[PDB]
Scaffold this active site. Structure first.
Site, short mmCIF file in Angstrom:
data_model
loop_
_atom_site.label_atom_id
_atom_site.label_comp_id
_atom_site.label_asym_id
_atom_site.label_seq_id
_atom_site.Cartn_x
_atom_site.Cartn_y
_atom_site.Cartn_z
N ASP A 56 0.80 -1.22 0.00
CA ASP A 56 0.00 0.00 0.00
C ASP A 56 0.84 1.28 0.00
O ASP A 56 0.45 2.28 -0.61
CB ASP A 56 -0.94 0.01 1.21
CG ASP A 56 -1.86 -1.19 1.25
OD1 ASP A 56 -2.26 -1.68 0.17
OD2 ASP A 56 -2.19 -1.65 2.36
N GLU A 125 -18.23 -4.59 10.20
CA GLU A 125 -19.14 -5.73 10.19
C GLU A 125 -19.09 -6.50 11.51
O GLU A 125 -18.17 -7.28 11.74
CB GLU A 125 -18.80 -6.66 9.02
CG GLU A 125 -18.82 -5.96 7.66
CD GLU A 125 -18.34 -6.84 6.52
OE1 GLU A 125 -17.89 -7.97 6.79
OE2 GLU A 125 -18.41 -6.39 5.36
N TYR A 126 -20.06 -6.27 12.39
CA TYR A 126 -21.08 -5.23 12.24
C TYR A 126 -21.28 -4.57 13.60
O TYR A 126 -21.01 -5.19 14.63
CB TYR A 126 -22.43 -5.84 11.84
CG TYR A 126 -22.40 -6.80 10.69
CD1 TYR A 126 -22.55 -6.36 9.38
CD2 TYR A 126 -22.26 -8.17 10.91
CE1 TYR A 126 -22.53 -7.24 8.32
CE2 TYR A 126 -22.25 -9.06 9.86
CZ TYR A 126 -22.39 -8.59 8.57
OH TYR A 126 -22.37 -9.48 7.53
N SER A 193 -25.87 -7.50 -0.63
CA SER A 193 -26.90 -8.48 -0.97
C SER A 193 -26.28 -9.76 -1.52
O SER A 193 -26.59 -10.18 -2.63
CB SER A 193 -27.88 -7.88 -1.97
OG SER A 193 -27.24 -6.95 -2.82
N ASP A 195 -23.70 -13.44 0.17
CA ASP A 195 -23.41 -14.24 1.37
C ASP A 195 -24.66 -14.44 2.21
O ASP A 195 -24.59 -14.49 3.44
CB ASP A 195 -22.31 -13.58 2.22
CG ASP A 195 -20.91 -13.93 1.74
OD1 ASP A 195 -20.77 -14.71 0.78
OD2 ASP A 195 -19.94 -13.42 2.34
N1 LIG Z 1 -16.72 -6.70 3.26
C1 LIG Z 1 -16.84 -8.12 2.99
C2 LIG Z 1 -15.49 -8.72 2.64
O1 LIG Z 1 -14.62 -8.56 3.74
C3 LIG Z 1 -15.63 -10.19 2.22
O2 LIG Z 1 -14.48 -10.65 1.54
C4 LIG Z 1 -13.42 -11.09 2.41
O3 LIG Z 1 -12.63 -10.01 2.86
C5 LIG Z 1 -11.55 -10.37 3.70
C6 LIG Z 1 -10.87 -9.09 4.16
O4 LIG Z 1 -11.75 -8.38 5.00
C7 LIG Z 1 -10.57 -11.31 2.98
O5 LIG Z 1 -9.59 -11.73 3.91
C8 LIG Z 1 -8.29 -11.89 3.32
O6 LIG Z 1 -8.12 -13.13 2.69
C9 LIG Z 1 -6.91 -13.22 1.96
C10 LIG Z 1 -6.94 -14.55 1.20
O7 LIG Z 1 -7.85 -15.43 1.80
C11 LIG Z 1 -5.69 -13.10 2.87
O8 LIG Z 1 -4.54 -12.85 2.08
C12 LIG Z 1 -3.65 -13.98 1.97
O9 LIG Z 1 -3.39 -14.71 3.15
C13 LIG Z 1 -2.79 -15.96 2.85
C14 LIG Z 1 -2.49 -16.69 4.16
O10 LIG Z 1 -1.44 -16.06 4.85
C15 LIG Z 1 -1.51 -15.86 2.00
O11 LIG Z 1 -1.34 -17.13 1.38
C16 LIG Z 1 -0.05 -17.27 0.76
O12 LIG Z 1 -0.09 -16.97 -0.62
C17 LIG Z 1 1.21 -16.96 -1.15
C18 LIG Z 1 1.28 -16.18 -2.45
O13 LIG Z 1 2.35 -15.28 -2.32
C19 LIG Z 1 1.63 -18.41 -1.28
O14 LIG Z 1 2.87 -18.49 -1.96
C20 LIG Z 1 1.75 -18.99 0.12
O15 LIG Z 1 1.91 -20.39 0.05
C21 LIG Z 1 0.56 -18.65 1.03
N2 LIG Z 1 0.99 -18.74 2.41
C22 LIG Z 1 -1.52 -14.72 0.96
O16 LIG Z 1 -0.21 -14.27 0.68
C23 LIG Z 1 -2.30 -13.52 1.44
N3 LIG Z 1 -2.48 -12.56 0.37
C24 LIG Z 1 -5.81 -11.92 3.84
O17 LIG Z 1 -4.90 -12.09 4.91
C25 LIG Z 1 -7.22 -11.75 4.40
N4 LIG Z 1 -7.34 -10.48 5.08
C26 LIG Z 1 -11.31 -12.51 2.39
O18 LIG Z 1 -10.47 -13.22 1.50
C27 LIG Z 1 -12.56 -12.08 1.64
N5 LIG Z 1 -13.35 -13.25 1.30
C28 LIG Z 1 -16.79 -10.37 1.23
C29 LIG Z 1 -17.04 -11.84 0.93
O19 LIG Z 1 -17.51 -12.50 2.08
O20 LIG Z 1 -17.97 -9.76 1.72
C30 LIG Z 1 -17.81 -8.36 1.85
O21 LIG Z 1 -19.05 -7.74 2.12
#
Ligand SMILES: N[C@@H]1[C@@H](O)[C@H](O[C@@H]2O[C@H](CO)[C@@H](O[C@@H]3O[C@H](CO)[C@@H](O[C@@H]4O[C@H](CO)[C@@H](O[C@@H]5O[C@H](CO)[C@@H](O)[C@H](O)[C@H]5N)[C@H](O)[C@H]4N)[C@H](O)[C@H]3N)[C@H](O)[C@H]2N)[C@@H](CO)O[C@H]1O
Ligand SMILES: *[C@@H]1O[C@H](CO)[C@@H](O)[C@H](O)[C@H]1NC(C)=O
Ligand SMILES: *[C@@H]1O[C@H](CO)[C@@H](O)[C@H](O)[C@H]1NC(C)=O
Length: 383
Positions: A56, A125-126, A193, A195
């Site tokens: 960032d 949330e929330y 709207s 999940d």
């Molecule tokens: N507002 C709602 C949303 O929040 C919601 O969607 C979700 O949002 C959240 C954030 O609030 C997301 O959480 C993130 O999820 C990421 C992936 O799942 C995470 O990032 C990754 O974490 C991994 C574990 O450490 C790492 O994995 C590695 O990857 C490497 C690649 O370099 C690989 O080589 C290695 O082997 C791995 N260890 C990865 O690096 C990292 N980027 C993050 O930490 C986390 N905060 C969530 O994913 C998301 N679903 C939405 C849907 O429900 O609804 C909205 O309203």
């Protein structure tokens, strides 16, 4: 004058191969408002928490994003604070007192100025959710925070936007959201709207059904997009403040062993946590749209695709795997429904999960639908 609101995930850049999605991949001209997700709040000082500072800040993530306005001056670039992974306890703690709220407000203003953002999207949330570290007093105090942020934004004199992402379940609204007062202070209400069903519910179902299905009962009776948006209207939110969320992803399930019933509402192996992880998102129960179409839509796919006649959503299954999602057909139906209702526009979670590579056909097929319908649509005066 309709909105196309595009949430951009800062962690999508770490997805392997064709899953990699960065600032440069955002189809800016398809959106009217783009939201960088997420920043957070500190546990101890109630200040803005930069969650991935190497990306960032050090690699200029925030500024790369906001400087897109040079080429696309008509587009608003904001930042979202919160998100699911951030939890709710730090926010309930932050709004507990006037002093802690004002400390956060000052930090927010400094942050927005520093990285040239057009405003802030609140994604706590929330408020009021016991399962998320909240308490009863969150409802009043979240409103206070919103009112205090708006006044600070006014004082800065840059015309910053203040928006909020919100749920649509009645019990969540009662616990956390003073609807009439909130919709008054906010430029837009981004209704999540989606999940609405998932592994947590203990049965297989599409997660953004538009209308009620026969099997919907008790808490699930009005837990659909149509009734949920109607709920926001009924509680006092003007039609022209409401933006309808569209998921560019599917909620998947692992069916119970020996279950040959693939209908909506069929029992699942809940302990599995959902469907098996896909190669790019690598998350149980969660498949990006491009991960679904590359599996379901291929010429020799062994997946069986069905249609929810009531919810107007596709679902597909193979073996023990079952996924409900949104495809061009369901998205189009929702776009027409949005215009029929007179809502402010459409929102997506998230732009980085569209078929941006064109693995399954045309690039950015889903966001192009939102852009096509909203750009030709005039938001009517409040009903
Ligand atoms: N507002 C709602 C949303 O929040 C919601 O969607 C979700 O949002 C959240 C954030 O609030 C997301 O959480 C993130 O999820 C990421 C992936 O799942 C995470 O990032 C990754 O974490 C991994 C574990 O450490 C790492 O994995 C590695 O990857 C490497 C690649 O370099 C690989 O080589 C290695 O082997 C791995 N260890 C990865 O690096 C990292 N980027 C993050 O930490 C986390 N905060 C969530 O994913 C998301 N679903 C939405 C849907 O429900 O609804 C909205 O309203
Ligand atoms: C920002 O832009 C620069 C120059 O193109 C690039 O080197 C850098 O990787 C970008 N940062 C991000 C996070 O996209
Ligand atoms: C995929 O997710 C699993 C479970 O969270 C994790 O153990 C693994 O490190 C992840 N694999 C990759 C390639 O990131």
């Amino acid at each position: 004058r309709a909105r196309v609101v595009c949430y951009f995930s800062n962690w999508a850049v770490y997805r392997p191969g064709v899953g990699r999605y960065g600032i440069e991949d955002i189809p800016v001209d398809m959106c009217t408002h783009i939201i960088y997700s997420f920043i957070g709040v500190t546990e101890d000082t109630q200040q803005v928490l930069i969650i991935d500072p190497e990306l960032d800040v050090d690699k200029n993530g925030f500024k790369n994003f906001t400087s897109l306005r040079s080429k696309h001056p008509g587009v608003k670039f904001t930042v979202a604070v919160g998100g699911w992974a951030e939890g709710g306890s730090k926010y309930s703690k932050m709004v507990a007192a006037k002093s802690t709220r004002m400390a956060f407000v000052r930090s927010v203003v400094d942050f927005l100025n520093k990285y040239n953002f057009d405003g802030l999207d609140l994604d706590w949330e929330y408020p009021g959710a016991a399962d998320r570290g909240g308490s009863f007093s969150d409802k009043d105090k979240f409103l206070y925070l919103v009112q205090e942020l708006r006044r600070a934004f006014i004082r800065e004199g840059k015309g910053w936007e203040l928006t909020a992402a919100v749920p649509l379940a009645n019990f969540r609204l009662m616990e956390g959201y003073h609807v009439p007062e909130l919709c008054q202070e906010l430029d837009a209400i981004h209704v999540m709207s989606y999940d609405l069903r998932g592994n947590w519910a203990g049965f297989a179902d599409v997660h953004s059904p538009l209308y009620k299905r026969p099997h919907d009962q008790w808490a699930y009776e009005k837990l659909n997009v149509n009734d949920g948006l109607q709920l926001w209207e009924d509680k006092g939110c003007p039609t022209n403040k409401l933006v309808v969320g569209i998921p560019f992803y599917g909620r998947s399930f692992t069916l119970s062993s020996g279950n040959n019933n693939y209908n909506l509402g069929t029992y699942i192996n809940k302990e599995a946590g959902g469907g098996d992880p896909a190669p790019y998102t690598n998350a149980t129960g969660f498949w990006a749209y491009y991960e679904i179409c590359t599996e379901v839509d291929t010429a020799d796919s062994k997946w069986t695709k069905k249609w929810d006649e009531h919810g107007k959503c596709p679902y597909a299954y193979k073996g023990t795997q079952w996924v409900g999602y949104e495809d061009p057909r369901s998205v189009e139906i929702k776009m027409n429904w949005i215009k029929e209702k007179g809502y402010l526009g459409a929102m997506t979670w998230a732009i980085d999960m569209d078929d941006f590579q064109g693995l399954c056909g045309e690039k950015n097929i889903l966001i192009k639908l939102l852009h096509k319908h909203m750009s030709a649509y005039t938001v009517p005066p409040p009903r």
